[PDB]
């Protein structure tokens, strides 16, 4: 009785490796002829009917905080974002001193110091000739310098362009597919707290559509949960890291722009055009958003009980609204048709819970120049949008941060965080883990090679 060793080729075995992915675009996206951001021109079309199959008698470990997919995706978005602003107009010469004042056209007192009317000296298509034009600018886009003189905040810092006028910022769902020799293991377990065994694991060539939504807190158009709302965290006990929670029922959102705006075409140079806000048609109001009281409270009442399991049954939960963060981590950032909204959020996190129809309206402000992916060295200008914007979307998840380690106090307060873009995509790629297939295999077998 003797046994020798043979080898097997193509045996299914997987390991961990670092690699990049590529695009996969649907036919519907290909229909659009606009070469906007996340366009299909530079992204390969996908294939229908993915070969998603189940796996049995296998246990796989998963991790969502150490996953490399989110890290590379974060760099991918910024890399393509810069390429969009390259081949069109530059807004370097806009910096000019402004002798600016207020404006009063039956304006509501709730938006008193937000709009200013004034003009400046700007170069025309020629060089010798000079001309002046006037436009309306927001409060946050003008600073104080030193009887009255104003200037943009973009002048004593880096200079940037405006959003290119031939592209749209509407999100497009794209699929990520690994190259040959690498697969994607998807975890379908109903109970999944980020890290742990995943007996229900299924492989798939490509993943479902992922929308690269822009938001700091209260992410929109996310992946809805199924049942038994879970809480995503790395250590829970440590408050340094944020807490990611997504709830089951979708709660709708209304956010309209009742102000009517008109665009004015100003010739900066030969072939360069700049768009500026003109006169306002109609009444002057303030932008706001509405949420149903019944839906919002029910969701909080349904998630508050869930969080008590980790901490304790007799735990008092209170919600705070954060404080000043230079309009970076202290607002609900979202975009509607190319217009960026940084608005109030104190009207949502204002309740307390004990152990044992009307809608909420909040005023806020809008600013044009923004720093998304802060990138101190660059910025972007928001062009005006004709007409009015009335965007409707969903809220799928929330970001929460614990307080300091004061003492063993049942009165525990959860406060919204935000500001980290890496956390935004961690709620959509927490079921995936790239693998490395090694066809080579070794196993003993009773065989002899004849001579």
């Amino acid at each position: 009785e003797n046994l020798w060793v043979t080898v097997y080729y193509g045996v299914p075995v997987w390991k961990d490796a670092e690699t990049t992915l590529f695009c996969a675009s649907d036919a519907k996206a290909y229909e659009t002829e606009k070469h906007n951001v996340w366009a299909t021109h530079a992204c390969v079309p996908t294939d229908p009917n993915p070969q998603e199959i189940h796996l049995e008698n296998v246990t796989e470990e998963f991790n969502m905080w150490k996953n490399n997919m989110v890290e590379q995706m974060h760099t991918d978005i910024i890399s393509l974002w810069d390429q969009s602003l390259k081949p069109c107009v530059k807004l370097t010469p806009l910096c000019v001193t402004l002798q600016c004042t207020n404006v009063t056209n039956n304006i509501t007192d709730d938006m008193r110091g937000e709009l200013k009317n004034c003009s400046f000296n700007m170069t025309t298509e020629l060089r010798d000739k000079k001309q002046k034009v006037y436009s309306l600018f927001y409060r946050l886009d003008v600073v104080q310098i030193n009887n009255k003189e104003y200037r943009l905040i973009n002048c004593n810092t880096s200079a940037c362009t405006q959003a290119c006028p031939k592209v749209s910022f509407e999100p497009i769902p794209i699929h990520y597919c690994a190259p040959a020799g690498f697969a994607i293991l998807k975890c379908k377990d109903k109970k999944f707290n980020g890290t742990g065994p995943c007996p229900s694991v299924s492989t798939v060539q490509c993943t479902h559509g992922i929308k690269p939504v822009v938001s700091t807190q209260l992410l929109l158009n996310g992946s809805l949960a199924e049942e038994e709302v879970m809480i995503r965290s790395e250590n829970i006990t440590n408050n340094a890291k944020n807490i990611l929670v997504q709830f089951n029922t979708p709660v709708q959102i209304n956010c309209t722009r009742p102000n009517n705006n008109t665009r004015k075409s100003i010739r900066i140079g030969p072939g360069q055009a700049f768009y500026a806000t003109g006169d306002i048609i109609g009444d002057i109001r303030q932008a706001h958003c509405n949420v149903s009281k019944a839906t919002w409270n029910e969701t909080l009442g349904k998630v508050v009980k869930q969080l008590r399991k980790h901490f304790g049954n007799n735990t008092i939960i209170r919600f705070a609204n954060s404080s000043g963060g230079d309009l970076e981590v202290t607002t609900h950032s979202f975009n509607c048709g190319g217009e960026f909204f940084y608005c109030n959020t104190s009207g949502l996190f204002n309740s307390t819970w004990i152990s044992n129809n009307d809608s909420i309206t909040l005023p806020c402000r809008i600013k044009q120049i923004i720093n998304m992916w802060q990138r101190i060295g660059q910025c972007m200008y928001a062009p005006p949008i004709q007409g009015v914007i009335r965007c409707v979307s969903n809220i799928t998840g929330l970001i929460l941060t614990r307080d300091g380690g004061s003492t063993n106090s049942t009165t525990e307060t959860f406060r919204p965080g935000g500001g980290d873009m890496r956390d935004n995509w961690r709620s959509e790629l927490y079921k995936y883990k790239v693998v490395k297939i090694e066809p080579l295999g070794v196993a003993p077998t009773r065989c002899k090679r004849r001579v």
């Binding site: 390969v44 796996l55 190259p179 492989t203 066809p439 070794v442």
Partner: protein, 122 residues
């Protein structure tokens, strides 16, 4: 069964079909990313063939070899290692047993290579 459709199943049934696991093995900013992935993917495929090519087999993908097999490496009966244990568990058990099994195959095959050429003359 499809792409890795029996990876977690018993190795006895997994060995029944292997081509299915070998089919999906080879098939302007984004241009660099696409090209880089393609070159890396094909490079790995050729590496495996080169490792198999030097042995006494090219594409048979079941390569019987006459090299000896130390008993201490497995220290288990043949019956239990062909009916229930999955392939994934087996790989973890031979994690330390790497870069030494290949050496035995190469040295023996090369040694028998000359022995398979001298006899041709006589």
């Amino acid at each position: 069964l499809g792409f890795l459709g029996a990876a977690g199943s018993t190795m006895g049934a997994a060995s029944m079909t292997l081509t299915v696991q070998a089919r999906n093995l080879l098939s302007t900013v984004w241009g660099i990313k696409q090209l880089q992935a393609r070159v890396l993917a094909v490079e790995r495929y050729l590496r495996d063939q080169q490792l198999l090519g030097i042995w006494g087999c090219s594409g048979k993908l079941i390569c019987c070899t006459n090299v000896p097999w130390n008993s201490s490496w497995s220290n288990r009966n043949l019956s239990e290692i062909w009916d229930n244990m999955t392939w994934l568990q087996w790989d973890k058990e031979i994690s330390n047993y790497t870069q030494i099994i290949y050496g035995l195959l190469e040295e023996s095959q090369n040694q028998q290579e000359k022995n398979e050429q001298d006899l041709l003359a006589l």
